[PDB]
Write an enzyme that holds these catalytic residues in place. Sequence first.
Site, PDB file in Angstrom:
ATOM      1  N   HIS A  61      42.946   8.400  61.403  1.00  0.00           N
ATOM      2  CA  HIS A  61      43.401   9.451  60.467  1.00  0.00           C
ATOM      3  C   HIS A  61      42.718   9.294  59.109  1.00  0.00           C
ATOM      4  CE1 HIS A  61      46.901   8.819  63.323  1.00  0.00           C
ATOM      5  NE2 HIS A  61      46.574  10.083  63.513  1.00  0.00           N
ATOM      6  N   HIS A  91      43.777   4.130  50.713  1.00  0.00           N
ATOM      7  CA  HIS A  91      43.070   5.042  51.565  1.00  0.00           C
ATOM      8  C   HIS A  91      42.746   6.291  50.796  1.00  0.00           C
ATOM      9  CE1 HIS A  91      47.181   6.365  52.052  1.00  0.00           C
ATOM     10  NE2 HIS A  91      46.629   7.554  52.197  1.00  0.00           N
ATOM     11  N   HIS A  93      41.981  10.796  51.287  1.00  0.00           N
ATOM     12  CA  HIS A  93      41.975  12.057  52.002  1.00  0.00           C
ATOM     13  C   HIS A  93      40.820  12.882  51.457  1.00  0.00           C
ATOM     14  CE1 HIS A  93      46.195  11.370  53.400  1.00  0.00           C
ATOM     15  NE2 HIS A  93      46.247  10.597  52.332  1.00  0.00           N
ATOM     16  N   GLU A 103      45.167  16.373  48.411  1.00  0.00           N
ATOM     17  CA  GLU A 103      46.516  16.660  48.951  1.00  0.00           C
ATOM     18  C   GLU A 103      47.305  17.290  47.806  1.00  0.00           C
ATOM     19  OE1 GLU A 103      47.924  13.191  51.191  1.00  0.00           O
ATOM     20  OE2 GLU A 103      47.262  14.516  52.841  1.00  0.00           O
ATOM     21  N   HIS A 116      44.824   7.196  47.454  1.00  0.00           N
ATOM     22  CA  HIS A 116      46.190   6.749  47.434  1.00  0.00           C
ATOM     23  C   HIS A 116      46.202   5.217  47.484  1.00  0.00           C
ATOM     24  CE1 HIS A 116      47.666  10.791  49.270  1.00  0.00           C
ATOM     25  NE2 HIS A 116      47.350  10.849  47.993  1.00  0.00           N
ATOM     26  N   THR A 195      52.554  11.449  53.087  1.00  0.00           N
ATOM     27  CA  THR A 195      51.928  12.719  53.438  1.00  0.00           C
ATOM     28  C   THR A 195      51.415  12.743  54.867  1.00  0.00           C
ATOM     29  OG1 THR A 195      49.684  12.145  52.734  1.00  0.00           O
ATOM     30  CG2 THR A 195      51.207  13.076  51.049  1.00  0.00           C
ATOM     31  N   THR A 196      51.618  11.657  55.607  1.00  0.00           N
ATOM     32  CA  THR A 196      51.326  11.594  57.052  1.00  0.00           C
ATOM     33  C   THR A 196      52.627  11.215  57.781  1.00  0.00           C
ATOM     34  OG1 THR A 196      50.647   9.271  56.681  1.00  0.00           O
ATOM     35  CG2 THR A 196      48.988  10.925  56.767  1.00  0.00           C
TER      36      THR A 196
HETATM   37 ZN    ZN Z   1      47.560   9.187  51.701  1.00  0.00          ZN
END
Ligand code: ZN
Length: 257
Positions: A61, A91, A93, A103, A116, A195-196
């Site tokens: 992901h 991590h 996005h 995000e 993040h 958010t996941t």
């Molecule tokens: Zn994140």
Amino acid sequence: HWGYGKHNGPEHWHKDFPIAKGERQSPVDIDTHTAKYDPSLKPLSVSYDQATSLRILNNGHAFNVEFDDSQDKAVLKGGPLDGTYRLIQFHFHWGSLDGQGSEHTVDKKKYAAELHLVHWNTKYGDFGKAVQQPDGLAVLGIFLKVGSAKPGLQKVVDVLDSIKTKGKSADFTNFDPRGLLPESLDYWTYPGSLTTPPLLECVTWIVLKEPISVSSEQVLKFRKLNFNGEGEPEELMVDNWRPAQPLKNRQIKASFK
Ligand SMILES: [Zn+2]
């Protein structure tokens, strides 16, 4: 089998994770005119000089840069937080194009990517216990725009070839996450969620106002990663972001005027 495709992407997640339609989901749009300055918020304290990175992992992901969090070595405190929160991983996005990828959004503006830095509240003893609490995590969110290169990101960029596919990891010691921060620590804060999946409502969000700049070449290397495992049809790891969720009964606070 959640993910970011047409058939398993964020509009589907509610079927396995009903909390997806909950009261404090993330990310959100940050309307900068409606965020209120809160003079009672303290400055943020980011103490990363003793941070001990260990490994980098493609989890299918995103990629996670993981830290030793068995002692108070890299911590976030102050700001809206009570207590001490330990860094466990960071991590990103990002998008398929520079016009999208973040995000959180700022007056509906999407950035090329979003970093993040994830921390857990040491009063709960471990990460798994912390995510079951409304104040269990503090996530420091930093936007990426495309422009000049970020020198302190390049060690990350250069290892991505070795973790191209889902489940691959690599040794990643002595990485200093101070090199990913902007000059200013002015921030917005609000209560929200991962958010996941599992989308748990356990996060104090701390979103920095000042983006960092990364180069086109740097973000092009994120987009060569794969969501698939080795020996599977190639699906590039791009657009691994959840869109903005309803704010509902929440107020976004600003640390600055
Ligand atoms: Zn994140």
